[PDB]
Symmetry: none
Subunit: 20 residues, 12 copies
């Protein structure tokens, strides 16, 4: 007997600007 | 007996700007 | 006996701008 | 000039009603 | 000039009603 | 000039009603 | 028993770029 | 027993870029 | 027993960039 | 000159339960 | 000259339970 | 010249329970 309700959300934002 | 409701969401945004 | 309801969503946005 | 406008979304709606009646004599 | 405008979202709604009746004699 | 404006969100709503009735004689 | 489970959502995404160049000599 | 579970949401994302160049000689 | 569980939310994200260049000679 | 972007969204949920 | 961006959202939930 | 960005959100929940 087991009733897991495991549930996730996630975000991400990488930004590698090499502006001269 | 097991009743998992595993469920995810996800986002992502890579951005490698080499603006001169 | 098992009643998984595994289910996902996902997004993505790569952007490699080399604007001069 | 230039431009690049992206947009994108996801929706989800559910009414799951799982049910289990494991029985052993 | 330049520009790059991105936008993106996720929604989710649920009414899960899991139920278990494990019984052993 | 340049610009890079990103935006992104996630929503979630739930009404889980798990229930278990483990019984052993 | 009884039950009445309702759920409903709205999404919206925009990139409006209005622009006006009113000129009078 | 009885039950009445309601849920409802709204999302919105924008990148408005209004611009005006009123000029009079 | 009875029950009435309501839930509801609103999101909003913006990148407004209004701009005005009123000029009179 | 006018550039309205008027725009709406709306929800509603009436519920008149007379459960005895 | 005018650049309105008027825009709304709205929710509502009436509930008149007369449970006895 | 005018650049209004008027914009609203709103919620509501009436509940008139006459439970006996």
């Amino acid at each position: 007997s087991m009733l897991d309700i495991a549930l996730l959300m996630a975000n991400a934002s990488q930004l590698k600007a090499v502006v001269e």
